[PDB]
Structure formats: structure tokens, C-alpha cells
Amino acid sequence: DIQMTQSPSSLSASVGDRVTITCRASQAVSSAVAWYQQKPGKAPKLLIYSASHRYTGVPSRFSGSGSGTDFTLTISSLQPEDFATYYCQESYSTPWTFGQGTKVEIKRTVAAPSVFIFPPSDEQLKSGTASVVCLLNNFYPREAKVQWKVDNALQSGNSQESVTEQDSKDSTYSLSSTLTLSKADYEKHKVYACEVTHQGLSSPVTKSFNR
């Protein structure tokens, strides 16, 4: 088909900033390119068709340029209701493939995460399964790494993570991670640790407990 390669995948910006999003196509594609805005839990919204034409009621801080292969969306002075995901889309051929989207998020200062570790409840252990949770709280930027060690042996494929959206006050993130393993394997071992790497952390933080 035709591929639409948006870049960057995300970018952090502040209000009144000029924001430039690029969309590169696998073919030449006339000017048959559109741009959409999407906020979570809502449908997309047409901003731009025909590469540069602005759809009706779309504010003039939005613009599109480009021809052939390199297309750009540009917000001139960002506004507090402009923090969304922007999709480009080829309108030349069928199906009408969309790019993978660029997320415009809020810039703020670096914020080290605050780490907490939680052992399994006792009543959960009656179920035969053991969930260990590591909480990374109120950090920025989003890039954080969590390592699970069980008696200094590090684990691979038994953890799941989940991150929140920027908080509505300090614009920070929070990460939960859940090591999950049988009551069997859980009893074999004593020390359970959760090692965090972040940009605000000058050395890695390890939180841990004994059972």
C-alpha cells in the first residue's frame, strides 16, 4: 500500500510555541494529504484537506504545506486546547492509510519519580498467585525504566506496565508495574526488588522487601 510515516511520535511543547509536525509518504501522492486532530475518547476532527486547505471553522493558527512526499502540519502559537494527537492521511489511493500519529504533550521541568513497592496481600496468596507492584509516582519526562529482580536474578517476561496521562495540575506521569508469578515460585525466594532508571535520577533507585 502507501505508507505514512509521521515524525516525531511525540513532542513536548509549551503554549505560544510554534509546533511543526512532519509526514513523509512512501509514494508521491499529488497533494492528496489530510490532517486530523484527535483528543482521547473522542472522534477525529478534520483540520486540513488537499495538503494546505483548512477545513471550515478550523482556526488559522493551523496550516499545512508540502507537496510530493514531505508534508508538514504547523501550529503557529499553541493554545491550551491544542494538546492532542495529530494524524496525517493519504487521500490519493484507497484504502486511505493514516499515519501513526504525533502526540503533542505539555512541556515542564524534569521531575524524578518517587518509588514505592508493594508486596502481595495475604488474601491474594490464598488464590495461588502473587502480584508484586512497583509504583513510580509523579515524574517527567515519560521515559522511565523498571527492572524486576528476584534474589538479584532479573526477570524478563512476567511484568506488565501502565502509565497515566499528564496530570491535570503538575503535568507529570505515574507508572505502575506488576510482576506476576505463582505462589509456588513466590515462596522459593526471599528478596523482591524493583529498580528504577529515570532522567531525573542521578543514579538508579532500587526499592525492595523481604518476605
Binding site: Q27, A28, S30, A32, S91, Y92, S93, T94
Partner: protein, 132 residues
């Protein structure tokens, strides 16, 4: 006002695949291709045109045709019928165009017979439409 001018891909020579992504060819204001058919962007009256050119150099007769269909019902048709004992090379060119009421999502496509014998260049084999 919508308009498209499509052109043959010469990297095929055994299929006539249309494209609007080069110099001289284009889509404007709503047109789009979908599987080698031009999609009509809105309902209204359009002028639709096509040209082809066949050629050869000379057992059985050779049937040439080119058609603009509405994806099947012919809008524009032409034939020619080149026969055996031709002591010199030949060359037949076919052109036509007309106004048609089309609806949104109608699919303009073209059928051709004697495809191997086509002369593919921007200025000799094309297919296009514009809203009135």
C-alpha cells in the same frame, strides 16, 4: 472545482495502470484512485476524456479497443481492426470525451484491448475528468 489527469505507467507494458503522481498528471480538489478506477468526489456533471495509441509492424486479425466504463456500462467507446497482409508498420490513435452526470463514489475506469500494442507516454495515453 475537482479535476484529474491520469497517465500510464510504462513500467508495466502488459497492464495499463493509471497514475496521477508525476509531472503532467494530478488529482485536484477531491479526486482519488481506488484500484485503477477514478473515484468521483461529489455528484454533478463532469467532462470525461481518454486517449490511447496502438502500433505494430506486421495469421488472424487483431482486435483493438479502448473504453471508458462506469464501474459495467460504456460511456465512451472505440474500435479498430488491423488485418494480416500489411507490408508496412501501422499506428492507430483513439480519442474521445463528453459530459456525463455522475454521482459521488461512481468509479470511472477504462478497458483496453490490444494492450501490448499501446504506446505509453504522457502525451499519447491518458484518461481524465473535470467537474463542470
Amino acid at each position: 472545482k475537482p479535476a484529474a489527469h491520469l497517465i500510464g505507467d510504462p513500467s508495466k507494458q502488459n497492464s495499463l495502470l493509471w497514475r496521477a503522481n508525476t509531472d503532467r498528471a494530478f488529482l485536484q480538489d477531491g479526486f482519488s484512485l481506488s484500484n485503477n478506477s477514478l473515484l468521483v468526489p461529489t455528484s454533478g456533471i463532469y467532462f470525461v476524456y481518454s486517449q490511447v495509441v496502438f502500433s505494430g509492424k506486421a495469421s488472424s486479425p487483431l482486435y483493438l479497443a479502448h473504453e471508458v466504463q462506469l464501474f459495467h456500462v460504456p460511456l465512451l467507446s472505440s474500435q479498430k481492426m488491423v488485418y494480416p497482409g500489411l507490408q508496412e508498420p501501422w499506428l492507430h490513435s483513439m480519442y474521445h470525451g463528453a459530459a456525463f452526470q455522475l454521482t459521488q463514489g461512481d468509479q470511472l475506469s477504462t478497458h483496453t484491448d490490444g494492450i501490448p500494442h499501446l504506446v505509453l507516454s504522457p502525451s499519447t495515453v491518458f484518461f481524465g475528468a473535470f467537474a463542470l
